[PDB]
Design a protein around this ligand. Structure first.
Ligand SMILES: *[C@@H]1O[C@H](CO)[C@@H](O)[C@H](O)[C@H]1NC(C)=O
Ligand SMILES: *[C@@H]1O[C@H](CO)[C@@H](O)[C@H](O)[C@H]1NC(C)=O
Lengths: 98, 262, 49, 54, 104
């Protein structure tokens, strides 16, 4: 399973900050313009329309990848081994691997 | 063991983050659900919230949650701290930002708590599936049967390598730091905490102040002020603003990592 | 492909390449809200399971 | 021993400079040192050492 | 939201016989199959956000006493649009829809 890591967006109040491609799996950055953010303090950025938000997101392995995961394997050919029991005459069972 | 990881969470502060369903409407909530992880078996889920559990503003005590009433960082005793998907869930544990709970199948996840009269609740949609282990699709874990391997969330640290990324809070916005004084507007630094003001009196005025500073201007709604506190960490959440040069990460431990159990 | 199997492929359990094709598109934040909405194809691992 | 960096100071990771308590003395400095040592292979030792305060 | 003498939006009034007694809203729980979120309460009416269910129960506490009433109205969740979501999403598209106003 994947985990979409979403870092904190970069909100520039009266500016246009722009994307910079980062070496990350399925990395997406977008620069949505005209955002008037509201937060608990209320009025996050001054400029009514000339506000920019840079949102980025990238896929990682989920935390559970170390416990459940599918291993893809190429098989070609191998040893054939077997455990064998032998008795002969009065000798009892020996049961050794070959 | 338990003490040292709870000590370790003291660098992290709760935060107020946007939440879809607060009850009435969508608001900024102290208990905002960041992530629900529900890929374990037998209906055990891990909810990352915006509130610290088991911490007190001065120390650790596993009966206290801490959460922001604004910029106050107030700490209470866990009054209800209830998790429910379609019927109430059983709080298996709570550590740091995270709570581990056994939940029935559902189409919502709500976490909420009481601070005296006040009730803080946050619901996200996050459909939760009960995941039977084995070759019979049972709906609730049986009292007898067969012990089969299964994925469960630990309550004790296994030898951690699962980390949560943390950063210093950026420019926490607050307009209670603005007031009208005489005829101009006043920026009051609460205590030993910097404040960035951006005051568009018609000339663009701005700066960072460690003390009270009247900024001229006339109305309160020209003088947007931002609290800068860099003494705590917050989770690298998509619901929290960040600034341009705010890259520095923090790398705290995650409790309740997945493990294979029976 | 995006959602069948091998949508997230890693050479080892601790590798750093982590090829991942999930069709992840970032979406416009809702008015007022500082959040980072995104849309993604559901995991092909669980679809396989 | 693994080495970690704080500004231009370089120190053994398990033994940060302060020792009795490195969050009460200067909380910002401890945080910034933990951020500077993000990629260290022995970051866990630092996080215990910094958080240690009896 | 009424008091025997006046209005105050923390008080309910109900008849304990012929007494017409007024209390503080103690719980005022509304539940269809899980508890609902009381959006508002005004006059005889309460407005609540409810999960899909087959019953509607309204109840309240007067000290030790619990007064509860369950009717068998089936509540259907009604998605707006062309996707059958079960709980309102956090993001998406703003589409026209029918809602109960919360003041007037
Ligand atoms: C054959 O060997 C097995 C061990 O591989 C042993 O348990 C068994 O007794 C042997 N066979 C007989 C008839 O005893
Ligand atoms: C650099 O290291 C020297 C030697 O310990 C010290 O005197 C100086 O203060 C350090 N500079 C900074 C900026 O930390």
């Amino acid at each position: 399973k994947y985990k979409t890591k979403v870092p904190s967006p970069v909100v520039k109040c009266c500016g246009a900050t722009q994307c910079t491609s980062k070496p990350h799996p399925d990395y997406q950055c977008q620069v949505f313009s005209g955002v008037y953010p509201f937060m608990w303090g209320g009025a996050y950025c001054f400029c009514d329309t000339e506000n920019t938000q840079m949102s980025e997101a990238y896929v990682e392995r989920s935390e559970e990848c170390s416990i459940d995961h599918a291993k893809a394997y190429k098989v070609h050919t191998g040893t054939v081994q077997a455990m064998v029991n032998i008795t002969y005459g009065s000798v009892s069972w020996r049961s050794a691997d070959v | 063991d338990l003490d040292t990881h709870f000590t370790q969470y003291k660098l992290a502060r709760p935060y107020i983050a946007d939440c879809p369903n607060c009850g009435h409407s969508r608001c900024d909530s102290p208990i905002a659900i960041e992530e629900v992880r529900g890929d374990a078996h037998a209906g055990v889920i891990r909810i990352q919230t915006s509130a610290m559990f088991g911490l007190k503003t001065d120390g650790v005590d596993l009966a206290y949650m801490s959460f922001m009433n604004g910029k106050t960082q107030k700490s209470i005793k866990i009054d209800n701290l209830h998790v429910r998907t379609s019927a109430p869930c059983s709080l298996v544990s709570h550590h740091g930002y995270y709570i581990l709970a056994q939940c029935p199948p559902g189409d919502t996840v709500t976490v909420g708590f009481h601070d005296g009269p006040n009730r803080h609740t946050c619901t996200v949609a996050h459909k939760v599936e009960f995941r039977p282990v084995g070759r019979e699709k049972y709906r609730h874990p049986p009292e007898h049967g067969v012990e089969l391997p299964c994925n469960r969330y630990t309550h004790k640290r296994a030898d951690q390598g699962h980390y949560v990324e943390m950063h210093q809070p950026g420019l926490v916005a607050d307009h209670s730091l603005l007031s009208i004084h005489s005829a101009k507007v006043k920026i009051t630094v609460p205590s030993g905490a910097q404040v960035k003001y951006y005051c568009k009196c018609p000339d663009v005025r701005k700066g960072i102040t460690s003390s009270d500073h009247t900024t001229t201007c006339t109305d309160v709604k020209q003088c947007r002020a931002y609290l800068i506190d860099n003494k705590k960490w917050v989770y690298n959440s998509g619901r929290l603003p960040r600034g341009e040069g705010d890259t520095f990460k923090g790398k705290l431990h995650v409790p309740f990592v997945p493990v294979k159990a029976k | 492909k995006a959602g069948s199997f091998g949508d997230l492929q890693s050479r080892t359990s601790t590798s750093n390449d982590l090829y991942a094709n999930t069709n992840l598109k970032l979406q416009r934040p809702q008015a007022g809200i500082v959040h980072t909405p995104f849309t993604q194809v559901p995991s092909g691992f669980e679809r396989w399971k | 021993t693994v080495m970690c960096v704080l500004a231009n100071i370089t120190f053994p990771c398990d033994q940060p400079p302060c020792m009795p308590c490195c969050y009460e003395k200067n909380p910002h400095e401890t945080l910034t040192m933990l951020e500077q040592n993000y990629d260290s292979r022995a970051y866990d030792q630092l996080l215990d050492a910094a958080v240690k305060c009896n």
